[PDB]
């Protein structure tokens, strides 16, 4: 399928449009390229304050009937360094234009502020709720307590920083695995490097008639995660969300054990 099922039973596409800050008018551009192409999810963060973009973008394709509010799966986040939760929410909400989030995620320091996340879940503002960057231990801290299971746990996974011990935590547990930065980022590379570069994911690639960044993405999904590539190229946009009529055959996903971790 092209989608996971979360614990909440919705369904989340496996590939989505990441999020970060640029100039004016870039991220909305992706945006509607993206859902133009065919994605039907898209990550946001108030972090990077794009928000309100974000809401144009989709207010453009919702009124030119490019897709339907309940095609999209909307993400967005908050990084608290409780009672301004839903008052973030809130503020959400209005920059992107909508009435519900399919995901809020949260990061704070490690409990009230889950609580606060727990009421929002509950009134349907956040249809599923989850964490940023829990390493296995912080999310095993949090399921022991929680009413509500995070559903997701959006971190860094790519194959030069596999998480493999979260991985197989999120698997016992239920909780989905969202990779950000899917197709890496020096500071979690082997000698800073290009993970995209490595010669394991050329050949496969050569292989299957793929680029290195597909297979990359095809990957994480075979794992089962799903993954936030960005893009504002229109056709590495359109390459990243072909990932779903092929596979990686099982000799060649072994391959990737041997990928030197930062």
Known sequence: ????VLNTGAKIPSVGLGSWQSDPGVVGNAVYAAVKAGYRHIDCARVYGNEKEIGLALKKLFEEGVVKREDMFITSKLWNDPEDVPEALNDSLND????????????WPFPATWGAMEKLYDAGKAR????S???SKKLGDLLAVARVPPA???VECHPGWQQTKLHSFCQSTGVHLTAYSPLGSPGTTWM?????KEPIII???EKLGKTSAQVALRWNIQMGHSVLPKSTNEERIKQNLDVYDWSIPDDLLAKF???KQA
């Open 1 to 4: 399928a092209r989608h996971f």
């Open 96 to 107: 992107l234009q909508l009435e519900y989030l399919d995901l809020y995620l949260i990061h």
């Open 128 to 131: 599923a709720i989850g964490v």
């Open 133 to 135: 960057n829990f390493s």
């Open 152 to 154: 997701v746990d959006q």
């Open 192 to 196: 800073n490097g290009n993970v995209l």
């Open 203 to 205: 050949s496969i690639a």
């Open 257 to 259: 054990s041997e990928i």
